[PDB]
Design a protein around this ligand. Structure first.
Ligand SMILES: Nc1ncnc2c1ncn2[C@@H]1O[C@H](CSCC[C@H](N)C(=O)O)[C@@H](O)[C@H]1O
Ligand SMILES: [Zn+2]
Ligand SMILES: [Zn+2]
Ligand SMILES: [Zn+2]
Lengths: 78, 52, 104, 55, 430, 91
């Protein structure tokens, strides 16, 4: 379901960054880099959860993993 | 059709008659580019005859 | 003679600059919630199943992913502007990731 | 303080994350300190390049 | 020509502003009130001598001006009376009305007008689609020979028949000097008329209508422009749609672009190309066509259909040349499955048995058609047996026995084909 | 053009420091003087500063070369310097 990140949505995301024109081949590249980033953060959150002896990933594990990667997130109980 | 598994392994035909069964299947489908020594085309023909 | 005169179309970029201002003024999530949730579940399935994902965890993941993508597109826009182009290409994405250190 | 002022230019009595993001990113030293943090529901400052505009 | 400004004005109820059938129609963003109205960051530039706020000028960097949005006083940082309030301040260009030779009343520039300058706001009543249909039917019953409707947006039109402004008198030009544009003023939408170029005094002001007839009959255009299409209509074209039938054209490798290019290069430059009819083949187009090798089986099927359909010598020559360029074995196997030999037999017969051409050119054709027959992969005379093309080859080597290269090539071809067989092939019940 | 590649080949195989020692020492002392006076310096601290500054400048020149390559040029320009610094996050 990587195709679920649809073309208008990624167009909107590029548009927030101030981009005027979009190449036709860029969408697969953005899907790939988003997959890589999500893979890394999800992996770290999952092993945090496995160390915590839990079966449900909470928001704290996600914020912890992100802050450990230098991508500190405010607003979710950090 | 070129895979490790074989269609005729689910039948009573002995492995010594597999090329005989594939020649029957290829000749039944009116193929004419077929040559006896080409096992790949035989396997394709029998695969398309049994699982079109 | 009951025909209608048409208003024609806008120039390429005018509606682009409009929607640039509109999306830079507003703050809602731009990725649909359910496909993102399915994607997160698909990625998480590969390590260990039966893993429940709180709604707040999915929301935090979505916010972080949107922030990362917006920052990457800002850097890629700087790269494209530097090369005297207005269209971003995958080579600018790869270069931005290279200089950022994300790609080895 | 800076967030209340930024809300005050927007004629609002509610401080929202948008005003906090505006207050953080519009001040040089505060942006330097809070460089690597992402404010949830904060958005992005309006910035359009000069040569990006048509002629 | 004598001025007709007051006479034109008396024909309708003059409006200073657009009127609305209801408050919902004509609203910007489909009525979604953008409470955060787009405020330009321009600083107010007050000239102390004239007391005029020069902000948001033509050469200023006002974002709203670039995006075709007007500043609203009390909401923008530019302050009141900025230079981007052209619609609201109603600062129209000076214009006059004069009687034309065939178009009736028309608008002319009373002064020299700069490029991109706002000329005049198109005025009328804002109406819905049903009201538009009712008014259109009533006017067609009245026999009115003039358009007075413009599309503000989807489902929302502006009528200039009974009430409006001078802009309703602007006439169509196929090479116009002015153009209509859509702008946003506050939470509303306006339609303005702007100068496309530098216009001098006395010149008529015209814009492209781009008429959506909605099934109405065409009206002839008497604008006098050299590039005139002759009729009022949002669309127009020439013979650049088809010269040959689609499967036959695509068989030759030609597409919509290649069929466009030939007609655009000659018909627009005073050389005759007939009306669309595939009963007569234009040999010059087929000779001038570009040829590329075939690597798609559907294109091979189209080639086989063209062989079965087209009788022209030149089209068959160029298809055979394209086959000569073609060297993909799978496409050739597909042609064999389609029995290309059967078609090539008739192609031979029509040219080298029936004689509609010259012997030297037919010899060149035969040398150009024996090569791919020699080159194609063959494994069994069952392929040939579906055509018996060998019989045709014997007949043509016997007829053109004096041309010994053709005879020797057909000798080599039948020698190669005679080596074939089918090893052992199991007989089938009959 | 040939000697440019010769210089690249020679310097990429060598490991000694390329910044001259005494001007760099005086530069470090001049910068440190305006924060506090009568400051002493260990030799190893000056050597650590020299090594770190050389590594940082080498990395910056490599990223700048990538930026120059992007714009279909072979000569690096100051706009490449501030582009690399801006993307890398320095102000
Ligand atoms: N170039 C042209 N030649 C002939 N008729 C034209 C024309 N341009 C516009 N018209 C006619 O003018 C109509 C637009 S209303 C224009 C004013 C009106 N014809 C008048 O003189 O009072 C169109 O429907 C069309 O029928
Ligand atoms: Zn302005
Ligand atoms: Zn203004
Ligand atoms: Zn015309």
């Amino acid at each position: 379901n990587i195709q679920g990140i649809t073309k208008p949505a990624i167009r909107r995301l590029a548009r927030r960054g101030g981009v005027k024109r979009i190449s036709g081949l860029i969408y697969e590249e953005t899907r790939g880099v988003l997959k890589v980033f999500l893979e890394n953060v999800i992996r770290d959150a999952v092993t945090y959860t496995e160390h915590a002896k839990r079966k449900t990933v909470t928001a704290m594990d996600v914020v912890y993993a992100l802050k450990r990667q230098g991508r500190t997130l405010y607003g979710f109980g950090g | 059709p070129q895979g490790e598994m074989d269609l005729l392994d689910s039948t009573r035909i002995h492995p010594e008659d597999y090329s005989l069964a594939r020649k029957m299947a290829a000749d039944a489908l009116d193929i004419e580019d077929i040559d006896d020594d080409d096992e790949s085309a035989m396997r394709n023909a029998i695969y398309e005859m049994v699982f079109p | 003679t009951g025909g209608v005169m048409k208003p024609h179309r806008y120039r390429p970029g005018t509606v682009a600059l409009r929607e640039i201002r509109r999306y830079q003024k507003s703050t809602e999530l731009l990725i649909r919630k359910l496909p993102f949730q399915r994607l997160v579940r698909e990625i998480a399935q590969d390590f260990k199943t039966d893993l429940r994902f709180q709604s707040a965890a999915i929301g935090a993941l979505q916010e972080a992913s949107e922030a990362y993508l917006v920052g990457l597109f800002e850097d890629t826009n700087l790269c494209a502007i530097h090369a005297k182009r207005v269209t971003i290409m995958p080579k600018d994405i790869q270069l931005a990731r290279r200089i950022r250190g994300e790609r080895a | 303080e800076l967030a209340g002022n930024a809300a005050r230019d927007n004629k609002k009595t509610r401080i929202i994350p948008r005003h906090l993001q505006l207050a953080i990113r519009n001040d040089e030293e505060l942006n330097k300190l809070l460089g690597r943090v992402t404010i949830a529901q904060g958005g992005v400052l309006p910035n359009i390049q000069a040569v990006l505009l048509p002629k | 020509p004598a001025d007709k400004t007051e006479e034109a004005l008396t024909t309708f109820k003059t409006l200073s502003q657009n009127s609305y059938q209801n408050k919902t129609l004509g609203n910007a963003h489909n009525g979604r009130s953008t409470a955060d109205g787009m405020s330009c960051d321009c600083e107010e530039n007050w000239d102390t001598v004239s007391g005029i706020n020069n902000a948001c000028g033509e050469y200023s960097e006002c974002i709203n001006r670039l995006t075709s949005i007007e500043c609203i006083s009390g909401t923008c940082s530019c302050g009141d009376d900025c230079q981007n309030q052209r619609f609201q301040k109603k600062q129209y260009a000076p214009i006059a009305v004069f009687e034309t030779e065939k178009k009736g009343y028309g608008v002319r520039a009373q002064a020299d007008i700069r490029q991109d300058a706002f000329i005049y706001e198109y005025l009328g009543e804002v109406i819905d689609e049903s009201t538009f249909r009712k008014r259109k039917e009533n006017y067609d019953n009245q026999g009115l020979e003039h358009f007075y409707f413009m599309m503000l947006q989807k489902g929302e039109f502006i009528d200039a028949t009974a009430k409006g402004g001078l802009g309703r008198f602007c006439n169509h030009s196929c090479r116009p000097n002015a153009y209509v544009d859509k702008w946003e003023v506050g939470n509303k939408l306006r339609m303005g008329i702007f100068a496309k170029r530098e216009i001098y005094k006395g010149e008529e002001i015209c814009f492209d209508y781009n008429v959506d007839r909605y099934g109405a009959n065409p009206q002839k255009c008497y604008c006098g422009e050299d590039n005139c299409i002759g009729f009022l209509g949002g669309r127009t074209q020439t013979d650049s749609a088809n010269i040959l039938p689609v499967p036959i054209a695509e068989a030759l490798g030609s597409t919509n672009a290649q069929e466009q290019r030939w007609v655009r290069l000659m018909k627009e430059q005073n050389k005759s190309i007939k009306a669309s009819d595939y009963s007569s083949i234009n040999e010059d187009y087929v000779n001038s066509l570009e040829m590329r090798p075939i690597a798609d089986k559907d294109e091979a099927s189209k080639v086989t259909s063209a062989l079965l359909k087209t009788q022209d010598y030149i089209i068959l020559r160029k298809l055979i040349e394209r086959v000569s360029l073609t060297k993909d074995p799978e496409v050739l196997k597909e042609i064999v499955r389609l029995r290309g030999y059967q078609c090539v037999a008739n192609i031979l017969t029509m040219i080298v048995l029936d004689q509609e051409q010259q012997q030297v050119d037919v010899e060149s054709f035969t040398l150009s058609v024996l090569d791919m027959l020699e080159s194609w992969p063959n494994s069994s005379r069952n392929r040939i047996s579906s055509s018996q093309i060998e019989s045709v080859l014997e007949s043509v080597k016997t007829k053109l026995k004096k041309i010994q290269p053709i005879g020797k090539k057909i000798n080599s071809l039948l020698n190669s084909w005679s080596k074939l067989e089918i090893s052992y092939k199991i007989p089938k019940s009959q």
